């Protein structure tokens, strides 16, 4: 499987209407080697997707939002499911690839009483702690603190890319919408490295995984950290 293979089928996979959803597993299958994906917890917390795949023959971990289920919103179960997988991938030098289409956290008194703050902070910590190479692609949406948790603004994401249909809005929704109906406000402030065509996605990621294989960072000494569990 050549690392420079184009994926034109991803050029129109994201619908123009934000009210209409799509399947992130299709994108994951299109990007990875031989379209082979080992999904972890496929039938639990279906609003998030985690699994193992290969890029250029190297094992990679995949985390992504699923707009089909609960509009891709994050909650307690998806938070912990993604967090432990990210921690395992970081603990064994496995690079992470993230696909971001999260509109925020699931509201309601059940989530608040269940401790949505702690469980969300678990995913925040898991992404902010990883020292492995990490590549992030924003497909359509990234709102609120959900934008920050899914590897955005320097606590996670060595390279960040946005599709032409991607957009970041702190409070989504005439003159103001046109300004923030595009990732240009993100690009001008250096939020994302570039705006790429979907067809090049795989190739880009492969190139990045070659450069970041020798990434080393230094952190202050500690016996261990305090997980927000």
């Amino acid at each position: 499987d050549p690392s420079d293979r184009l994926v034109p089928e991803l050029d129109t996979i994201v619908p123009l209407e934000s009210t209409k959803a799509y399947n992130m597993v299709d994108i994951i299958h299109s990007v990875v080697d031989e379209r082979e994906f080992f999904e972890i917890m496929p039938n639990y917390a279906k609003n998030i997707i985690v699994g193992f795949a290969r890029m250029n023959g190297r094992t990679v971990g995949i985390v992504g939002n699923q707009p089909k289920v609960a509009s891709g919103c994050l909650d307690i179960n998806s938070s912990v499911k993604g967090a432990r997988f990210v921690r395992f991938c970081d603990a064994f030098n496995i690079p992470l690839i993230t696909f971001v289409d999260v509109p925020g956290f699931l509201p309601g008194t059940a989530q608040e009483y269940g401790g949505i703050i702690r469980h969300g902070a678990k995913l925040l910590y898991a992404f902010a702690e990883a020292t492995v190479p990490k590549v992030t692609v924003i497909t359509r949406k990234a709102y609120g603190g959900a934008y920050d948790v899914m590897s955005s603004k320097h606590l996670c994401g060595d390279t960040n890319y946005a599709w032409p249909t991607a957009e970041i809005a702190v409070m989504g929704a005439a003159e103001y919408i046109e300004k923030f109906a595009n990732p240009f406000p993100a690009a001008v402030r250096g939020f994302v490295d570039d705006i790429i065509q979907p067809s090049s996605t795989r190739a880009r990621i492969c190139c990045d995984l070659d450069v970041l294989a020798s990434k080393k960072v230094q952190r202050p000494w500690r016996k261990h950290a305090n997980i927000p569990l």
Partner: protein, 673 residues
């Protein structure tokens, strides 16, 4: 393609799909600016991309986008298009469109409104043909109002009776009848369905012809009275009265009959004052007696094959005729060059009623453009989706050769090298048809699919040698995957000790039988022992490419590995048909013998709503048989709408969640079996 001959400057193609792409291509070859009309869902289609400029015309439904005549006229006015090309279908047969275009300022690339009106109605066409001294299908002239008139006129014409609905078409509103009670009941129900759908309610009685051969003649005429016949075409392999396989030179016909049919078609075209490209269709019996049947006043879908054997670009000639130039070819210039065969690759399931429309999005699409003597006409690209609004036709595949055998061989090779992943297609049916013994011999009729597969399409019934080759290929692929699984990079801390296995003993389950296979690897060559039969399989064993070319005992075979699981399941497209094979090791099979079979009735007979939300509308109607994976209704929650499928496989008895029903999570939605 001489550019010195001045032609129109701007042409607007009022169509979509592959015909729009073909028209845009032939206009680009002629140095003409092109305007493409499109709907919202087609804003990223291929013909929009290859056009000079594009205009959005309306929403997804065809009644509001490709039939909204006011919108097309507004687009023409705002783009100042000199000419308009309707392709086939849509508004190509609408008198009002041509009348308005000729009224305002627009020239219409097609037949005049007089010819379209003359040949629009079947009764008028038949009477005009009878007045045009051409052989016609024998029957009673006039409109039948009651079934008793039908039976009395069926007394003398013959026992085989056909009930036909005037005008319209598309293989609908037409039926057969044998008995007199059959005559009444068929006439009554045909009148009912014509009132329901057609609305004309005009029915006619015809003498059915057994084992008919559908032969078309492509006529081309200018406005100066010249008329030419461009050989013939054979379109006999049909289901639902719709053609799938077409053949340019008629093997059944000879020179004299072809010349007579061409002369009759030219005479009919002159009588109707045709001034464009059209086709006249005939039914030929066993004794070579052709009878007229319908005239298409537009470009046929299967026109490329007669282009291949004649070397003429039909759309270019149509444009030149519409400009006013005379025909640049004489009847003696027309000649037969080689042989041509075309198949219609549809997005349909051939195992159900010889084709049932299917929907989906194309994850992978690769045409065999690098093969010798192959031409593909498609408006389809990777990522395109097959919606319900338009025809589920993926592509048209044409192959040409020096003779019939070379063309058929090249067509089989092209069909075996055609990658379509995302929807279900009918490539298996086409490949089965083109390699059939009867099709090769040439004794075919319109009931070919009816009698070759009386119980329906079942697949490719593979022989013993083919079964051995398939088993050897599957075993070799399994062993190649296992061997690739052992190729890690050097660790330098814990070196990998590669196992030195020499023989792989495998149990391969195919259909319902179990075979014992012994595989050995010698570099790039696999020696395979299947039930005592020895075969050699060689290939590059590239496990990532969609197409794999292998050589089994010197025979070259192209196979596709559609799916593969760690449990041993594997789907292989071989000779055009998809086979499921389960491959295990001998120890694995022996231990699997102890596994208990689990009944797969599943749970949750009542479907549970995944999220609470109201239903804007219901796509399907209660009483329709559906299965799991087919969308039923659209439920909106958190300002996002999901068109979820049926929870359990069963017919939709009743949609409990109608419009305005705010159904909660985990609740009954649709009564299913």
């Amino acid at each position: 393609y001489d550019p010195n001959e001045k032609t129109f400057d701007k042409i607007l193609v009022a169509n979509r799909g592959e015909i729009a792409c073909r028209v845009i291509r032939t206009c680009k070859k002629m140095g003409i600016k092109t305007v493409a009309i499109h709907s919202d869902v087609d804003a990223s289609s291929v013909h929009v991309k290859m056009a000079d400029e594009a205009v959005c015309v309306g929403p997804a439904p065809t009644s509001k986008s490709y039939l909204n005549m006011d919108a097309i006229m507004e687009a023409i006015k705002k783009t100042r298009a000199q000419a308009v090309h309707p392709g086939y279908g849509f508004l190509s047969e609408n008198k009002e469109f041509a009348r308005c275009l000729a009224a305002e300022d627009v020239v219409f690339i097609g037949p005049d409104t007089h010819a379209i009106q003359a040949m629009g109605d079947k009764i008028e066409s038949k009477l005009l043909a009878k007045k045009a001294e051409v052989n016609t299908i024998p029957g009673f002239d006039g409109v039948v109002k009651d079934a008793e008139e039908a039976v009395r006129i069926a007394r003398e014409i013959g026992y085989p009776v056909m009930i036909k609905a005037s005008a319209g078409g598309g293989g609908k509103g037409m039926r057969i009848a044998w008995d007199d009670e059959e005559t009444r009941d068929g006439f009554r129900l045909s009148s009912q369905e014509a009132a329901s759908s057609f609305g004309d309610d005009r029915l006619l009685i015809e003498k059915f012809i057994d084992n008919p051969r559908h032969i078309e003649i492509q006529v081309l005429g200018d406005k100066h009275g010249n008329a030419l016949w461009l050989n013939e075409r054979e379109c006999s392999i049909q289901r639902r009265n719709q053609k799938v396989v077409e053949e340019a030179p008629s093997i059944f016909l000879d020179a004299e009959t072809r010349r007579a049919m061409g002369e009759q078609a030219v005479a009919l075209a002159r009588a109707v004052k045709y001034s464009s490209a059209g086709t006249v269709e005939f039914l030929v019996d066993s004794k070579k007696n052709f009878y007229f049947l319908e005239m298409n006043t537009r470009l046929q879908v299967e026109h490329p094959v007669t282009e291949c054997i004649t070397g003429l670009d039909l759309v270019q000639e149509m444009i030149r005729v519409a400009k006013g130039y005379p025909l640049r070819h004489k009847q003696a210039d027309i000649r037969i060059n080689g042989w041509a065969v075309e198949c219609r690759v549809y997005a349909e399931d051939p195992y159900k009623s010889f084709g049932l429309p299917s929907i989906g999005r194309l994850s992978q699409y690769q045409e065999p453009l690098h093969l010798p003597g192959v031409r593909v006409d498609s408006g389809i690209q990777p990522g395109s989706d097959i919606s319900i609004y338009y025809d589920p036709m993926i592509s048209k595949l044409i192959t040409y050769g020096s003779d019939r055998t070379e063309a058929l061989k090249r067509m089989a090779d092209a069909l075996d090298n055609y990658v379509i992943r995302g929807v279900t297609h009918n490539i298996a049916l086409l490949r089965e048809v083109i390699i059939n013994s009867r099709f090769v011999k040439g004794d075919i009729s319109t009931k070919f699919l009816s009698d070759v597969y009386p119980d329906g399409f079942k697949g490719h019934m593979l022989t013993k040698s083919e079964k051995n080759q398939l088993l050897a290929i599957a075993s070799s692929l399994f062993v190649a995957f296992q061997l690739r699984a052992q190729h890690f990079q050097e660790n330098s801390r814990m070196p990998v000790i590669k196992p030195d296995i020499a023989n792989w003993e495998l149990s391969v389950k195919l259909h319902d039988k179990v075979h014992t296979v012994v595989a050995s690897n010698n570099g790039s060559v696999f020696s395979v022992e299947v039930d005592g039969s020895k075969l050699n399989v060689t290939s590059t064993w590239n496990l990532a490419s969609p197409l794999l070319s292998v050589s089994v005992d010197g025979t070259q075979r192209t196979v596709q590995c559609l799916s593969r699981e760690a449990g041993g399941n594997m789907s292989i497209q071989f000779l055009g048909t998809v086979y499921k094979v389960n491959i295990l090791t001998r120890l694995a099979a022996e231990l699997n013998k102890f596994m208990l079979e689990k009944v797969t009735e599943d749970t949750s007979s009542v479907l549970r709503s995944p999220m609470p939300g109201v239903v804007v509308a219901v796509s399907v109607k209660p009483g329709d048989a559906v299965a799991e994976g087919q969308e039923i209704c659209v439920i909106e929650a958190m300002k996002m709408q999901n068109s979820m499928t049926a929870g359990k496989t069963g017919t939709v008895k009743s949609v409990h969640c109608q419009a305005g029903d705010t159904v909660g999570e985990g609740d009954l939605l649709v009564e299913l079996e």
